[PDB]
């Protein structure tokens, strides 16, 4: 009963399958948090495994560019994952409002995202669901940190060992190897980083179609291009890093470590 005794609930911030995210206050400390509230009434034993996996993965990850878990609280009928409150909103909304980022801003942005991904990979975590909605700005004040969030689809992997871990992720950001239903691992996250960097620089995605089957064909074939006029003034070094992230063959796809050494990131 630690949550009911110590915290008060306020407005909804998001929704999930069996869950809700809400601002809460730890009343005596006067400190605000975001709580994922899961209804655990007649949860499947598998769904219990998934809940404990998310909590365990979230406890592992200590990084400036990852949302911190503060507590995991089991009450009768409800479980609470208490995270930092981040008030800057989704990266998604910032990109739509500004339309696109300058190369210097996009680079600073993707640099933080890759550092968070590098940490995940070093700790044996694959997110599987990177996209602008899952990346949150630490404040509304321009220059605010990006924080990786929503490890609900994250998996634990043993070093570089890959398997068919299941079909999970978001259509626009899915890797060819996930869509083919082939074994995969850490590189699925670098593929999604490629999609996000593309969006950062021109404010629309490299893969989109009204027909989902045609969308998946385009992705599996790495069928993206750099149309005029929006790409007319973008450097080849930016195109190059995107190319290396959007490499179909996952062995030859740039790693988070390699991407952070790419001149377009490191030589500024």
């Amino acid at each position: 009963t630690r949550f009911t005794e110590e915290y008060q609930l306020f407005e909804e911030l998001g929704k999930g399958a069996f869950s809700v995210v809400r601002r809460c206050v730890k009343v005596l400390a006067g400190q605000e948090y975001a709580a994922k509230i899961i209804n655990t009434k007649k949860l499947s034993a598998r769904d219990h495994q998934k809940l404990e996996r998310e909590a365990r993965i979230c406890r592992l990850l200590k990084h400036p560019n990852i949302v911190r878990l503060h507590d995991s609280i089991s009450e009768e009928g409800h479980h609470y994952l208490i995270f930092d409150l981040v008030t800057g909103g989704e990266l998604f909304e910032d990109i739509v409002a500004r339309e696109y980022y300058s190369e210097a801003d996009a680079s600073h942005c993707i640099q933080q995202i890759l550092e968070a991904v590098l940490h995940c990979h070093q700790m044996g975590v694959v997110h599987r669901n990177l996209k602008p909605e899952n990346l949150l700005l630490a404040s509304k004040l321009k220059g605010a940190a990006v924080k990786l969030a929503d490890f609900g689809l994250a998996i634990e992997v043993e070093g570089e060992q890959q398997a068919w871990f299941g079909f999970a992720g978001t259509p626009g950001y899915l890797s060819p190897e996930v869509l083919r239903k082939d074994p995969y691992g850490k590189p699925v996250d670098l593929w999604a980083c490629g999609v996000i960097l593309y969006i950062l620089l021109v404010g629309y995605p490299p893969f989109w179609d009204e027909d989902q089957h045609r969308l998946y064909k385009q992705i599996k074939a790495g069928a993206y291009d750099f149309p005029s006029p929006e790409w007319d003034t973008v450097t080849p070094e930016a195109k190059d890093l995107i190319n290396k992230m959007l490499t179909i063959n996952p062995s030859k796809r740039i790693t988070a470590a390699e991407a952070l050494k790419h001149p377009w990131i490191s030589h500024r």
């Binding site: 998604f92 669901n129 909605e133 689809l153 999970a168 978001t170 626009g172």
Partner: peptide, 12 residues
């Protein structure tokens, strides 16, 4: 021309 849009996550 491709629009930036929110998309649902899947688990199958």
């Amino acid at each position: 021309r491709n629009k930036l849009r929110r998309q649902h996550d899947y688990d199958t």
